[PDB]
Design a protein around this ligand. Structure first.
Ligand SMILES: CCC(=O)SCCNC(=O)CCNC(=O)[C@H](O)C(C)(C)COP(=O)(O)OP(=O)(O)OC[C@H]1O[C@@H](n2cnc3c(N)ncnc32)[C@H](O)[C@@H]1OP(=O)(O)O
Ligand SMILES: *C(=O)CCCC[C@@H]1SC[C@@H]2NC(=O)N[C@@H]21
Ligand SMILES: *C(=O)CCCC[C@@H]1SC[C@@H]2NC(=O)N[C@@H]21
Lengths: 132, 404, 70, 515, 271, 344, 25, 24
């Protein structure tokens, strides 16, 4: 569900009108005509939030960790512990679905606590390294 | 090294391997003592403890607790046999959309006898039910205490009985008997509010026929001693005698439909159309029949179910203890969607006279209805108390004062 | 414009069938259209009929809570 | 079958055996270390012959090698003829580690104490994990931790640290109301120095990492004694001021002494130094304003600028929160604030009237205090003083500046009766602080002009602003009293406030502290 | 409550000759009965005992007494009638007595010597289950002080009924002669050793001797107060002479138990 | 007055807090300090005096609105119910959780990957983010009903519970109890952080406060274990022994007194010859056995310390079912009294 | 459950609207 | 009461439908 209306439950029914077979979807709060009983004493509908962490403006709010954006295999590691890197520098390359994705440094600093090696399978959200 | 598919198990040192391990253990909990025992149960014609739970609850609503439990006894070589779940299935679910807590005993595990972990699981669900204020349903099949474990079993029985007493009048408690409940398994049902036994496949008795034969010399079968009919007609312990397991489940669902989840929540009211007008104006043909129901001669009987059905909604009436003390009829119905408890004299049995059994039956029904805020309607046609020296010697005074 | 509408996922009815369908559905719809606020009446509430120990935490979490919920 | 006499004789020998479950091998080690047995400690604590032992024959289920008691001695008795529950670790059985029956016995004792409403004392020397069943040790650490909540605020809880408390053993004592430790014998820490060295590389001794005095200064220990006999006597004295539980009354001791002004009262008229900058010992006042010199101090070392103690007014126990000018000018620091807050909540829970003795400049200024959390600790102290329902009487000796005034039993913070000695100074800030604020406006410390201006301002400020008289005029204090009236005035005031009912208050789950 | 001058010292130091008689009271042979009034009058003050329903269900004795001036209700099994077995009448008698004492704040002391329930089709048909649950319910519901003294026997469901620790007994003590088990040694052996007894049957060994050997082993290993003591179900195994001291201490301390049940309009005791 | 309130939101470089100013500090103690070092918004947030730091007053207002959207108006009322009934069946987002925990132990990961998936939507509203960053305290919704989430953050300091984390969790739990929010614990932690500074900062007393708060709370409590639950961490993160209502573990869970490594050194301090070759192999084999047999979910599962070991993708709907069962929880026998006492 | 049927007339035609028996709406 | 307008989607196209407000 992306929009506010997508959150309303629905029931799909088969209706025959003059022989025609129609496949009608009905919301769970349909106030058609005098029909009511909509919502509840304290039920509020709102646009749901995506299952994603914020956006670019807070890429790392005081966050030193570099996290894998997708599950895959670390096919290359382009840094070593104690290496200084700048924003945009390549840190690792993860192969997912037989395609290469570069994971780069989001901030300026020293690579510390490098945690992965080439060939290691990595899950989404795994900490690759901390830039300090 | 490579392995054939049959022997391979995913590397346990990985997340996928650990998921696979959990799946293997969960699959093992389905047949804790082997598929042969399940086949034996089905051939005998019964449901397994898991099938009973899944049949009673709404589809897909069961959440199981302590599925991987094992017993920790070492007495008499018990440690060599530790089936998963330790012989009782416990959890929570929904019946007709309303939450309940449930346990079901498994007669294939040590004869269904109660051990330490067994009792601990039952105590866990009992505490959950008391805490959440939701009904507790127990399905009882077991051979009393597990003898190899010792007095720890008695400790757990005491804990279970204490929990039943604490819940008495706080949440509905319904006990289904679907096997031989012996020894200590009888007392918990006796403390619960309602008892539903299956006709030919369930028994309750404290001491078995063997001990009875040894001590008193009497010969009696389990069915005669503690059959469903015995506890309905004679001891007045069973509230319902089902023709089968599905029928017993149906009766339990109907019972729950009339009761609230706890002693302080509102009851399960149904929406009905109320005809507008005076009571004279809103008479129906079915109502008019009551004007001729009563016979002319005072000696002539009539069936009080005629009045009961004609005053209840949709003529639906769930009787309780139907086969016990027929001179009084007690049950549940609805008046304009409101659940009510009917207590009525039955002229066709003993002229409707009150007696010891009718007094006790009606008394406990009334006390259950009051505990759970269900109003009561009394249909009265009673000439007195059943005369006889046996009544006096058995305590018609003391035991009839209970209804009062 | 963020409200749930009726959807005819399959079929292409003509205006006559659409009108018949909508009339029947509107007639089927009912229940409490614009009900008044449900009147509070705590008289004889079940919580008041219970025996509470003089030092029972349910005197706070069940009795007071029920009387104060508003 | 054995005869009845044989069964009884068998029982007697079994009980004599259970009194020393660990046998000669462990008894020898214990006597080499020269430490008494658990039952010896219990019998020294309790009244002679009053101990009734519960679970002396408990054993680990299904374990051929279990020993009676499972490592703890639990039971009940009397201290000064008043009921108490007691448990004591026994290090001769499984090193006194926490097993299943250990936990069950202690839990049953805690339930018994909650049921009967009596204090509970625990003599702790070792409750480590059982290497055989460490998961069981973890589970039962958690179980006992749960059961402390039943007792929190219901009955007094006392812990006697007679040994090294480590790992999960520390979680139960820290929940109790009083902790008394033997000096070079009782320690408390989560992790040991060896593990600390292994993980972080730091080098630290036990004394640094949780000696009795170190923990007392940090506030984790309320009392440090030199011997277990002193610990027992401290416990008896502590219990003599308290009721058995939240509902009962406390003992009344020597009511009605000296109902008329005495020379000891008249000594107070000249006890405060003439000069403002001079420090003095507040005990010179605390030893004269109560029934006698029985001022029983708690957590002497934690915040030395604050004194928390028990005393008696007309035989009735009271809590005393006093400032100590002799230490750090009596300023309220982090430890002082927490000590006062904890003491206030405890005294309110056990219905002891609170007496505030005020001579303080307020919060101690400093970056260290700011980083240590002065703001929330002051907030907790505010919250506690206002939440308390017990009678509240305040006596201001010299200084009540700013937050110190507000928090040391101010009428604004719900105190019932307020009094000030004629030496009292109630102001937002001291004369020196105000003078600095004024002088910093001029370009330089141009003497003698600047010094003359500051001196005149300070003189005027001390004559007009930092005085009892503005508060007296506005009604912020009930009366300015001659110092010698204090003792009998407190008697009258507390006797008026005996049956105080605090309201309006809205009952709810609980209030919220800053935490 | 009558004022009574309690002697000072420990229970051992305050033992009386009447107390010492309890040491030898119990018969040597477990099959030989004894009068439980002997225990009742020796633990009650001035030997006074107001019995209630003495001529009814003689297998259980209920009545009133005083311990150090405190009124108490005694419920005791009587070995001289039906070997002390619980039956329908005894259960109902004790149940209502216990409920009366609980209503009026009178603590209860149970004296336990009970082998089980009385076997019989008549009991089953008259409702030993439903009507014996009344005693369970009454005891479990009681919030007054509850003390249990087990003299010889406490088996099975009778153990659960007659003041078990988990049913809420505040204090439980057992005499050295106590015998706490799931059931008797004979039935226990005939069940736990079915395998070996049937092997002996196959090989022709003397089953009538093997069974007695195993029964002796079972009795010597498990039929005693010590397994319950290990589990903590028995607070202490005491010499019989200590009984009055333990009871008096418990009743003095348990004047006002801070205990409660969940809120309810009332219970739903079996009827 | 501000420090008594439930939520403090400071504007960066515009809001400061301090009892005493830097000039007076200079006059008294002679030490020199700036406003940012003394009571800056970020510094106070790290210390735990400020719950939120924002860049503008408009952002502060929006944060306040969002914060209130999860709460009732008072201790007695009900909170708003937002978007009930969404996604009533297992979704690909649920199935992603089946492979979210790294294979190799000691591999840190972001707990928000789990938090954003086991609740109604991505609306996980964190509070006191900068304080004790090893712990996440937040509001979420389960089937539209607000709940308080306490989770460990392996991404920061291994997820160990330090002083600030303990105090944050304790205060949050008390607040959620006061306003009837069910508590959900998401456990991945080795326990307390060992160290002299942690010892001197009050780790014992703060852990005691966390123990007290968890037991005191009357609201429903549901725990889900993700990997590590060692010692005090296991006990405090909603263990069944501390009155948690329903306890679940993912098969990656590890429940033990101490980790395999720590137990290995505890073994090796006997025959302590770290320079020997054989001791290294002994440690490796001991670690293998310990992680196969002791630090697993199976011992707890078979003893009943945890109600069920679940497949990860079941978490969201299982939480829905559990909290629906626990709507009307009434805490067990409790003696009404003035108040409880907590270690301070 | 048997389908429910309703007979309607729109303009000059007669139509039948068939719906599931348990249409909740 | 006044008439009411419902919006119905028929294969993706929007379609208004005005009905009496008294239907029930
Ligand atoms: C409170 C104290 C008590 O309640 S003492 C426990 C009461 N004693 C009993 O066994 C009750 C009566 N038992 C029986 O005679 C039968 O087991 C009853 C219940 C009638 C069931 O008979 P039936 O369905 O034919 O089974 P079965 O006995 O042939 O075999 C059952 C399997 O389970 C076992 N079992 C049975 N009861 C117990 C028990 N109480 N403790 C331990 N194990 C028990 C049986 O030995 C048998 O095991 P197996 O399959 O042969 O290995
Ligand atoms: C007629 O009045 C005398 C015999 C019948 C009496 C009937 S029997 C049943 C009722 N009970 C009673 O005492 N009298 C009535
Ligand atoms: C001998 O071992 C068996 C016969 C005696 C059994 C006795 S009878 C009375 C008690 N009730 C019971 O069930 N068993 C006991």
């Amino acid at each position: 569900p992306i929009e506010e209306e997508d959150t309303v439950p629905r029931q799909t029914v088969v209706v025959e009108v003059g022989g025609r077979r129609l496949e009608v979807s009905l919301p769970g709060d349909l106030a058609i005509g005098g029909g009511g009983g909509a919502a509840a004493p304290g039920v509020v509908r709102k646009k749901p939030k995506p299952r994603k962490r914020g956006g670019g403006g807070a890429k790392a709010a005081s966050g030193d960790a570099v996290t894998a954006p997708m599950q895959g295999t670390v096919v290359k590691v382009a840094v070593e512990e104690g290496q200084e890197v700048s924003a945009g520098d390549l840190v690792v390359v993860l192969e997912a679905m037989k395609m290469e994705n570069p994971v780069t440094a989001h901030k300026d600093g020293t690579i510390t606590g490098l945690a992965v090696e080439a060939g290691a399978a990595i899950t989404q959200g795994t900490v690759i390294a901390e830039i300090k | 090294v490579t392995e054939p598919s049959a022997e391979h198990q995913v590397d346990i040192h990985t997340t996928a391997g650990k998921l696979a391990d959990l799946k293997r253990r969960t699959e093992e909990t389905l047949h804790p003592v082997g598929e042969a025992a399940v086949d034996k149960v089905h051939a005998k014609g019964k449901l397994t403890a898991r099938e009973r739970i899944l049949a009673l609850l709404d589809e897909g609503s069961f959440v199981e607790l302590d599925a991987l439990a094992k017993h920790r006894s070492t007495n008499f070589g018990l440690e060599k046999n530790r089936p998963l779940g330790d012989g009782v299935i416990t959890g929570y679910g929904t019946i007709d959309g309303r939450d309940v807590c449930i346990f079901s005993q498994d007669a294939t595990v040590f004869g269904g006898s109660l051990g330490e972990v067994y009792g601990e699981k039952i105590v866990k669900v009992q505490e959950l039910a008391i805490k959440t204020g939701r009904p507790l349903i127990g399905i009882n099949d077991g051979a009393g205490a597990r003898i190899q474990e010792g007095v720890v079993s008695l400790g757990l029985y005491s804990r279970i009985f204490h929990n039943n007493i604490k819940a008495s009048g706080v949440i509905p408690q319904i006990s289904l008997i679907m096997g031989a409940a012996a020894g200590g398994h009888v007392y918990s049902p006796a403390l619960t509010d309602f008892v539903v036994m299956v006709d030919q496949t369930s028994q309750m008795f404290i001491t078995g026929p063997d001990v009875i034969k040894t001590v008193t010399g009497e010969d009696v079968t389990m069915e005669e001693l503690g059959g469903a009919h015995t506890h309905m007609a004679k001891s007045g312990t069973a509230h319902y005698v089902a023709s089968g397991e599905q029928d017993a489940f149906d009766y339990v669902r109907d019972l729950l439909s009339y009761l609230p989840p706890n002693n302080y929540a509102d009851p399960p009211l149904y929406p009905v159309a109320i005809p507008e007008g005076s009571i004279e104006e809103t008479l129906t043909d079915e109502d008019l029949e009551l004007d001729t129901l009563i016979p002319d001669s005072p000696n002539q009987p009539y069936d009080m179910h005629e009045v009961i059905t004609r005053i209840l909604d949709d003529d639906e009436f769930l009787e309780v203890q139907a086969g016990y003390a027929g001179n009084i009829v007690v049950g549940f119905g609805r008046v304009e969607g409101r659940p009510v408890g009917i207590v009525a004299n039955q002229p066709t049995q003993f002229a409707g006279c009150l007696d010891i059994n009718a007094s006790e039956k009606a008394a406990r029904f009334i006390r259950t209805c009051d505990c759970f805020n269900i109003p009561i309607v009394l249909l009265v046609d009673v000439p007195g108390f059943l005369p006889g020296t046996d009544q006096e010697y058995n305590g018609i005074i003391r035991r009839g004062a209970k209804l009062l | 414009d963020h409200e749930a509408h009726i959807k005819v996922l399959r079929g292409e009815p003509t205006p006559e069938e659409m009108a018949a369908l909508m009339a029947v559905l509107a007639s089927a719809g009912g229940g409490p259209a614009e009900p008044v606020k449900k009147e509070r009446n705590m008289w004889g509430h079940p919580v008041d009929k219970l025996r509470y120990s003089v030092f029972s935490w349910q005197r706070v979490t069940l009795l007071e809570r029920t009387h104060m919920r508003r | 079958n054995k005869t009845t006499a044989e069964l009884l004789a068998e029982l007697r020998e079994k009980l004599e055996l259970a009194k020393e479950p660990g046998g000669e091998k462990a008894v020898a080690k214990r006597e080499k270390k020269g430490i008494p047995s658990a039952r010896a400690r219990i019998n020294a604590l309790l009244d002679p012959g009053s101990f009734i032992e519960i679970g002396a024959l408990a054993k680990t289920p299904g374990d051929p090698n279990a020993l009676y008691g499972d490592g703890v001695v639990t039971g009940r008795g009397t201290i000064d003829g008043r009921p108490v529950g007691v448990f004591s670790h026994d290090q001769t059985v499984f090193q006194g580690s926490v097993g299943e029956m250990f936990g069950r016995k202690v839990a049953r004792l805690m339930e018994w104490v909650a049921m009967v409403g009596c204090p509970i004392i625990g003599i702790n020397d070792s409750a480590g994990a059982r290497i055989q069943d460490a998961v069981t040790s973890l589970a039962w650490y958690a179980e006992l931790g749960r059961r402390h909540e039943m007792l929190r605020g219901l009955v007094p809880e006392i812990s006697l640290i007679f040994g090294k408390c480590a790992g999960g053993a520390v979680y139960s004592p820290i929940q109790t109301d009083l902790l008394v430790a033997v000096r070079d014998q009782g320690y408390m820490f989560i992790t040991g120095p060896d593990v600390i060295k292994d993980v972080t590389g730091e080098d630290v001794t036990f004394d640094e990492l949780g000696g009795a005095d170190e923990q007392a200064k940090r506030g984790n220990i309320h009392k440090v004694v030199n011997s277990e006999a002193e610990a027992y006597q401290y416990v008896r004295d502590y219990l003599s001021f308290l009721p058995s539980n939240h509902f009962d009354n406390p003992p009344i001791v020597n009511p009605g002494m000296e109902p008329e002004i005495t020379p000891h009262d008249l000594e107070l008229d000249s006890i405060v130094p003439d000069a403002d900058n001079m420090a003095y010992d507040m005990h010179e006042i605390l030893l004269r304003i109560f029934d006698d010199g029985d001022v029983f101090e708690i957590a002497e070392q934690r915040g030395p600028a604050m004194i928390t103690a028990f005393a008696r007014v007309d035989g009735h126990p009271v809590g005393v929160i006093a400032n100590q000018p002799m230490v750090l000018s009596g300023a309220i620091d982090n430890e002082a604030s927490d000590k006062a807050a904890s003491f206030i909540r405890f005294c309110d829970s056990y219905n002891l009237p609170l007496v505030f003795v005020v001579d303080t400049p307020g919060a101690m200024p400093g970056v260290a205090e700011e980083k240590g959390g002065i703001i929330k600790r002051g907030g907790r102290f505010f919250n506690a003083i206002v939440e308390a329902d017990v009678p509240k009487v305040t006596v201001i000796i010299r200084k009540a500046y700013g937050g110190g005034y507000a928090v040391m039993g101010s009428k604004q913070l719900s105190a019932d009766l307020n009094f000030a000695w004629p030496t009292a100074r109630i102001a937002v800030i001291g004369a020196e602080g105000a003078a600095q604020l004024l002088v910093k406006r001029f370009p330089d410390p141009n003497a003698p002009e600047v010094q003359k201006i500051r001196d005149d301002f300070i003189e005027g400020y001390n004559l007009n602003m930092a005085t009892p008289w503005i508060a007296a005029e506005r009604g912020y204090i009930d009366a300015v009293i001659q110092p010698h009236e204090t003792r009998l005035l407190l008697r009258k005031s507390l006797r008026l406030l005996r049956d105080k009912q605090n309201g309006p208050k809205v009952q709810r789950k609980h209030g919220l502290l800053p935490l | 409550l009558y004022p009574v001058a309690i002697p000072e010292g420990s229970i051992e130091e305050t033992l009386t000759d009447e107390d010492l008689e309890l040491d030898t009271l119990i018969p040597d042979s477990p099959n030989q009965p004894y009068d439980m009034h002997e225990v009742i009058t020796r633990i009650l003050d001035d030997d006074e005992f107001l019995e209630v329903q003495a001529g009814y269900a003689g297998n259980i004795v209920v009545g009133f007494g005083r311990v150090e001036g405190r009124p108490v209700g005694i419920v005791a099994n009587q070995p001289t009638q039906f070997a002390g077995c619980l039956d329908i009448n005894a259960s109902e008698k004790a149940a209502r007595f216990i409920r009366t004492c609980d209503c009026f704040n009178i603590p209860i002391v149970l004296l336990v010597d009970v082998p089980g329930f009385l076997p019989g089709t008549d009991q089953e048909y008259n409702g030993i289950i439903r009507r014996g649950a009344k005693l369970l319910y009454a005891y479990g519901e009681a919030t007054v002080a509850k003390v249990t003294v087990i003299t010889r026997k406490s088996y099975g469901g009778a153990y659960c009924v007659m003041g078990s620790k988990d049913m809420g007994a505040d204090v439980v003590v057992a005499w050295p002669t106590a015998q706490i088990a799931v059931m008797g040694a004979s039935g226990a052996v005939g069940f736990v050793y079915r395998q070996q007894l049937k092997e002996a049957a196959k090989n022709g060994e003397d089953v009538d001797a093997l069974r007695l050997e195993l029964q002796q082993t079972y009795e010597d290993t498990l039929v005693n107060p010590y397994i319950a003591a290990e589990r903590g179900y028995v607070d202490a195994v005491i010499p019989p002479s200590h009984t009055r001291g333990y009871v008096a201490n418990a009743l003095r301390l348990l004047e006002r138990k801070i205990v409660q049940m969940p809120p309810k309009k009332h219970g739903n005791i079996p009827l």
